[PDB]
Amino acid sequence: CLNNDPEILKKIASIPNLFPTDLEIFQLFTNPSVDIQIINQYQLLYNLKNDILTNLE
Amino acid sequence: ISSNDAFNMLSLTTVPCDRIEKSRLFSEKTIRYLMQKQHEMKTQKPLTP
Amino acid sequence: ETLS
Amino acid sequence: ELNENARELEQIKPKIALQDKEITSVLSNLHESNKRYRFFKKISEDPVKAL
Amino acid sequence: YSPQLTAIIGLKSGTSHDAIFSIYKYIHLNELLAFENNRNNHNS
Amino acid sequence: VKQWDLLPEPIRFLPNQFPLKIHRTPYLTSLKKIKDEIDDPFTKINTRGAEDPKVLIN
Amino acid sequence: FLTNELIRLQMEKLDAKLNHLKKLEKFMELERKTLERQQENLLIQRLN
């Protein structure tokens, strides 16, 4: 809406430890003592990370 | 107690106002530190892919 | 195309 | 390397604690001498009312 | 790996971790997901 | 006819109470000010209620 | 005057060091993300 900083996806992807990795998601999925609702939130955040990385390219 | 002590120093001391000397502004510790740091600041990769 |  | 850095931090901490003690002492002394300064200034600026 | 595996993943040899991770990536990629039904069935 | 209200007009519509400055003193600074005002030689912290009416209202 | 100079120089050195280290961290983070994405892409291509 503002159109001030074009390199916003790169700056967001450069923030250290702002997203979970692949193997952490994997360990969450294989560990059976977890709730489905937390799985869903981590899945949404992971999809957001992937979409940002795609739009960067 | 502290007001008593301050007024005692002011009024009950028999020293003329001239003979009171000035004290230091810099202890010798800070002078040594400042000289050492002046020396050490007188001695003083673009993201390779 | 076999990859995609 | 994690263990080494933890070691160096634990070695560096005591001097910092000592210097914090000294800093608090100096701050208290500054408060006391500011009290005295305000006293003497009030007396010198209007002596009769101050007394 | 056994010929039933290296057919699915283009890898002759790897740790158990690699095989498990790739099989899970496979069932997620084809939306077979906690029940899963296919090619892994007839191959394995 | 006479007209009057039960309560007085709030406190901010009074012509004397018009904002010139907001006093946003933090909590630690307020504690420091309280310590400085109690630790003064010429402190008025114990005037008493019968010697000053403003102290009584407060 | 020397004291004022030394304080100013100290604050400058501190903020310069912090800026440099933060730039390094951001570079490393973006690089990790890129490597992860590339390896996932290769794995998916092999499977397909």
Add this chain to the structure above:
Amino acid sequence: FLTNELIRLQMEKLDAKLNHLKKLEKFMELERKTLERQQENLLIQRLN
């Protein structure tokens, strides 16, 4: 006088942590090496 003493104590305090920054700077070299190794692997797997 007391203010100058305070300033000296505070600068002495800052110097120790400014020195402690260097080891944390070395862990960055560790991470850099590991990233290059992961890149080795990705390259060779793509060629395979």
Add this chain to the structure above:
Amino acid sequence: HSHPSDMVIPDHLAELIPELYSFQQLVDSEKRLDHFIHLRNLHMKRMVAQW
């Protein structure tokens, strides 16, 4: 028993002695440093857990 208000330089000492202003700035800079170091520690731990 030390009180958190000991470290406050009220408002008028700092305009009687301007250097006190700078002193506060030094204090704040130190805070920054500390937080940065803190983050680094956390970060390193995470990387180990990853590796």
